[PDB]
Amino acid sequence: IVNLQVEMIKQFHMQLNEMHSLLERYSEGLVAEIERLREENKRLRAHF
Amino acid sequence: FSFGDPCGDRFERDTRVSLFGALVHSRTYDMDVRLGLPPVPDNADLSGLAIKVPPSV
Numbered sequence A: 001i002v003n004l005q006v007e008m009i010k011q012f013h014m015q016l017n018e019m020h021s022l023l024e025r026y027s028e029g030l031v032a033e034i035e036r037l038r039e040e041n042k043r044l045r046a047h048f
Numbered sequence B: 001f002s003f004g005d006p007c008g009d010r011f012e013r014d015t016r017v018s019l020f021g022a023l024v025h026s027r028t029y030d031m032d033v034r035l036g037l038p039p040v041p042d043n044a045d046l047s048g049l050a051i052k053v054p055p056s057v
Helices: A002-026 A029-047 B010-017
Strands: none
Touching: none
16 A cells, blocks of 8 residues: 555656646747737838 | 830839839839838847848848
8 A cells, every 4th residue: 555655646746747747838829920920010011 | 105014124123113223122013002111120229220131032
């Protein structure tokens, strides 16, 4: 039971860290979109 | 009876899109374009004003 508990705690910790990492990965795009639209508007204004 | 469209000669084409070289950073075939300049870069207050180097292409 003690071995099971220790292994379970380690696995829980690892799984928590993996879930945190996955949420961080799945939750820069906005900045790039803003930059692209700014570039597009500046190009439009200069061309006009 | 028209100023012929400068579609043929590259020199004439550039003259037309530059308005006989009047346009600096823009080219246009539209006669009704509202002329605008490129916006002031956001980093100008942070990085200063750089001399825009024309792209080599």
